[PDB]
């Protein structure tokens, strides 16, 4: 083999922790349709993996689909507000509230800063479903599961 230049851009070398890429005469199968060796992970909670992730090119240590990040607790929805940054998208939510005295409703938003695997590329105004995670950054506490 020889090395990419579109999966490499960094001073250090980009690789998956999980599996042996140095491989070699490959002892298998573990690998993805059929292709060089790769690690991919079937998370439960009734979600089913992307086709894309399994067969992918990409190197990510934060997605639950090719790394040891585990999705566990709360499960949320929302829509998309802004595609900025690198792998970090921004969710808006909207929901109501009730004041007992008036007996009328009221509108409120929150927002969250979540992780998006390079497997997906969802556009502003799309729905999404996400999952609970351990802290991956200062704000970031969720990671995408599934787009709509």
């Amino acid at each position: 083999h020889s090395v990419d230049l579109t999966l490499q851009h960094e001073k250090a070398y980009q690789r998956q922790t999980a599996v042996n890429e140095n491989s070699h005469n490959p002892n298998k199968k573990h690998v993805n349709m059929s292709g060089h060796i790769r690690y991919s992970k079937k998370i439960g909670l009734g979600f089913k993996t992307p086709k894309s992730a399994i067969n992918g090119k990409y190197i990510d240590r934060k997605c639950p689909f090719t790394s040891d990040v585990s999705i566990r607790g709360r499960i949320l929805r929302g829509v998309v507000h802004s595609t900025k940054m690198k792998r970090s998208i921004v969710i808006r939510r909207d929901y109501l509230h009730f004041i007992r005295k008036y007996q009328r409703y009221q509108k409120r938003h929150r927002s969250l800063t979540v992780h998006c695997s390079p497997c997906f590329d969802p556009k502003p105004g799309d729905e999404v479903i996400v999952g609970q995670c351990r802290p991956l950054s200062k704000t970031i506490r969720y990671n995408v599961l599934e787009v709509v």
């Binding site: 439960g44 909670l45 499960i75």
Partner: protein, 258 residues
């Protein structure tokens, strides 16, 4: 770290007063939890009345005259939970504590055979060095485990002088159950359908004699036997039936005449 318990932070099921000291005993870490159990000194004194006060209690206990599970227990405090057996030779009494209708602890009295018999649930199943399988329950490990291997949430039959394990019983439809926790405990029922919700609490649906069916979760369920003639252990005067508030009240009146 907390070493003190108080009378207003202690359960209602022990039936201590607001008054008469502001402190209650904090039982140690042990076979059972702090939020359900009955500690030793609470049993002896406030129930069986062989102690009138604190000093009395330890003047029994510390001489090794009280034995849960065939092992004499010196300590003043030490918890005793659901499905244990307390044997105090000197009297000729034996107890098997249990829950009973109205959610509150109860005391049965058992003879020879069942003073050596117990039951244990299965919480988890895991593997240890040398590929030796292991189980874990409320009280303790114990090792391997055939009677024939199987699976979590199931219920065993354990003998205390030596292991003679009669069989075991499983969690499957048409079987029988007694309950813990959940403000639904002290009842008994069948097992209809068990709903499974992944990543989340698992919900059961039950039944009991002469209908009035109900529901609970699945970690509040503890199996008993295949059927209600197949039970290994004895049960209180009530068979785990709730009856209506009005019925109860009325009956208490009518019989009070004496």
């Amino acid at each position: 770290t907390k070493k003190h318990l108080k009378r207003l932070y202690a359960p209602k099921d022990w039936m201590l007063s607001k008054l008469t000291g502001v402190f209650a005993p904090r039982p140690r870490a042990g076979p059972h939890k702090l939020r359900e159990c009955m500690t030793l000194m609470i049993i002896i004194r406030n129930r069986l009345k062989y102690a009138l006060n604190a000093a009395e209690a330890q003047m029994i206990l510390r001489q090794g005259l009280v034995c849960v599970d065939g092992k004499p227990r010196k300590d003043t405090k030490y918890p005793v939970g659901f499905m244990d057996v307390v044997e105090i030779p000197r009297t000729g009494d034996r107890f098997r504590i249990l829950y009973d209708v109205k959610g509150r602890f109860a005391l049965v009295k058992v003879g020879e055979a069942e003073g050596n018999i117990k039951l244990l649930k299965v919480e988890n199943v895991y593997t240890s060095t040398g590929r030796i399988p292991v189980a874990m329950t409320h009280d303790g490990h114990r090792i391997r485990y055939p009677d024939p291997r199987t699976h979590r949430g199931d219920t065993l039959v354990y003998n205390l002088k030596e292991k003679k394990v009669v069989d075991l019983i499983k969690s499957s439809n048409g079987k029988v159950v007694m309950v813990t926790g959940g403000a639904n405990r002290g009842r008994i029922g069948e097992i209809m359908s068990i709903e499974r919700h992944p990543g989340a609490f698992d919900i059961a649906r039950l039944k009991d004699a002469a209908g009035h069916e109900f529901a609970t979760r699945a970690s509040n369920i503890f199996v008993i036997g295949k059927d209600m003639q197949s039970v290994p252990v004895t049960l209180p005067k009530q068979q785990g039936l709730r009856i209506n508030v009005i019925q109860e009240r009325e009956e208490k009146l009518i019989a009070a005449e004496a």
